[PDB]
Subunit: 154 residues, 3 copies
């Protein structure tokens, strides 16, 4: 079938499936943001999708970013009616450096880049264009609810 | 079809689909509990559901709570036929204030309320009735496993 | 089919197991003994490969016991159709560092204290070969061609 995608700015990029049978469409950052230990942000994708009713999108981590960095993405449940900007819900869960500073910053590959500041160690720079998350779409069941006193069939 | 729900106490609320085409059902806390930085708890819903065979429940965060507070909910996999009280598996992942106390507490909206004690900064109070989590029901594939020496299709 | 092929990569490997015929997932066992101290991160090998067919994704995910009773945080892995690699449990010990308090026991994945081979920092876990650390839940996926549109039709 087809999934409609709107790009909402010049900074947006069509999501992308790595191989032909891969679960997820890789999702790209539309923003450049510095995120220091213990900091939280919603990173904009500048992408809207129209998931049909009877499916849910799971906006979720990539295992390389996840395993190799302190960047923790809380999986977002994207409803069928939602035509807004998909935001990536992120925390840098590194423990604070208590003021050790260094001239480099980490990127989402776990490598060190040149920065515009001498920044606290454990700080990441997410750059516009970074392949930061993925979007997996799964069918759902959304029945009517019946309150009962008894069910019937850690 | 229909999903059966049992309210297990007077503090239990029915799960709630917010908007017409929402994936899941919002789940309320049946307890009032303080959760200071780095603390963990299973928050009782006092609700049981009966997910049919062929499905799993995902008992998961709401994006507002998740993004605006330090309350981290670990997604629960709710098996068909689990008829127990659904527990919300939660951590306050704020780093401890090292002794700094404030007369307010945070709630799940990110906002400050009067509290019963002067409490460590970064503490949340979860109140009975708070819309804390959500439940999304997905079909599953549950095959027999075959051990193979080599993969063959 | 209603068959999933599974390939054990070593003698430290254990066949995944369903807990009841009503359970969503297959319990997945550690193939390695690893110590994980507060704030540390690792990918725990299972020495299991699976062949998830096209149209599905595996979700390599926490068990509620381990998760609620310990500081071991497992980031849910999205296991693609046709990935025949070693399944890796992406794990962090998210306890805050005990700053040099050491004790003769270590924690296990059940929240209990075991004798260990070193006097280690308090909050450290020992994950043992054969521990039932995660589960795998397999769900159908929707993988449509994306259509970029100008307008659709928290
Ligand atoms: O990580 C996320 C999560 C959600 N979203 C969007 C899509 C989703 O359909 C919408 C609402 O998700 P939640 O229901 O998880 N948030 P909450 O329940 O706090 O807000 P609302 O009152 O709108 O349902 O927010 C994101 O862009 N990224
Ligand atoms: O966040 C959760 C997760 C699970 N549960 C319930 C429903 C689920 O069917 C049940 C078991 O889930 P797991 O299989 O993840 N727990 P574990 O494997 O530790 O226990 P068991 O041996 O009972 O399967 O616990 C919750 O109430 N909240
Ligand atoms: O926790 C995990 C996650 C993934 N995996 C495997 C299975 C999956 O099919 C593969 C890649 O998953 P991602 O797409 O999340 N990783 P990434 O996007 O960083 O790498 P790739 O470039 O391989 O897509 O790694 C694990 O063994 N454990
Ligand atoms: Mg990938
Ligand atoms: Mg909602
Ligand atoms: Mg289990
Ligand atoms: Mg933490």
């Amino acid at each position: 079938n087809t999934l409609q995608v709107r790009l909402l700015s010049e900074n947006a990029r069509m999501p992308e499936r790595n191989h032909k049978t891969d679960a997820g469409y890789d999702i790209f950052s539309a923003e450049t943001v510095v995120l220091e230990p213990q900091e939280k942000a919603v990173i904009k994708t500048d992408v809207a999708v129209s998931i049909p009713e009877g499916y849910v999108g799971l906006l979720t981590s990539r295992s390389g970013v996840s395993s190799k960095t302190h960047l923790v993405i809380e999986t977002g449940k994207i409803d069928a009616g939602y035509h807004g900007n998909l935001g990536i819900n992120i925390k840098n869960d590194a423990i604070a450096s208590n003021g050790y500073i260094t001239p480099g910053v980490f990127d989402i590959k776990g490598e060190i880049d040149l920065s515009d500041a001498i920044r606290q160690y454990g700080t990441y720079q997410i750059n516009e264009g970074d392949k930061l998350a993925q979007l997996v779409i799964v069918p759902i069941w959304t029945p009517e609810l019946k309150q009962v006193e008894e069910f019937e069939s850690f």
